[PDB]
Amino acid sequence: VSTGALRTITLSKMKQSLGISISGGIESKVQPMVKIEKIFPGGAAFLCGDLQAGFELVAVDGESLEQVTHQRAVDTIRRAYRNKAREPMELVVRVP
Amino acid sequence: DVEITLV
Ligand SMILES: [Zn+2]
Ligand SMILES: [Zn+2]
């Protein structure tokens, strides 16, 4: 796979916790992009073998996370994961 | 300046 390849990954919203920390955001000069910082046990992401820490988040449920602030990214993913009617969650990512 | 938040 080439650096930064795009990949669409689906994730069920059944678990109460997404179980991920995210890092970065357009205010950051060091990490302008939003990346998965850590995947935590107990959550939904720990169960997806295609999700890894270090992936760049591009979109969630059709909502762009490109060039967004950290605050908007957190808010956008939270709203998507709590929207249980839309199942599964769709995450567009760029792999390292 | 990298922010990290548990989602
Ligand atoms: Zn600020
Ligand atoms: Zn991005």
Numbering used by the authors:
A (entry chain A): 851 to 946
B (entry chain D): 734 to 740
What does the study report here?
In cochlea, deafness-related protein PDZD7 is an indispensable component of the ankle link complex, which is critical for the maturation of inner-ear hair cell for sound perception. At the extreme C-terminus of FCHSD2, there is a type I PDZ-binding motif (PBM, a.a. sequence Ile–Thr–Leu–Val) for associating with PDZ-containing protein.
We proceed to solve the complex crystal structure of FCHSD2 tail/PDZD7 PDZ3 by the molecular replacement method at the resolution of 2.0 Å. Consistent with our biochemical characterization, the FCHSD2 tail/PDZD7 PDZ3 complex shows a 1 : 1 stoichiometry in the crystal structure. FCHSD2 tail stretches along the groove in antiparallel with βB and inserts into the hydrophobic pocket of PDZD7 PDZ3. FCHSD2 tail forms the complex with PDZD7 PDZ3 that buries a total interface area of 526.6 Å2. Val740 from FCHSD2 tail inserts into the hydrophobic pocket of PDZD7 PDZ3 to form hydrophobic interactions with Leu868, Ile870, Ile872, and Val924 of PDZD7. Intriguingly, in the FCHSD2/PDZD7 structure, Gly869 and Ile870 at the carboxylate-binding loop provide amide nitrogens to interact with the carbonyl oxygens of Val740 via a highly ordered water molecule. Arg928 also participates in interactions with the carboxylate to further stabilize the terminal carboxylate group.
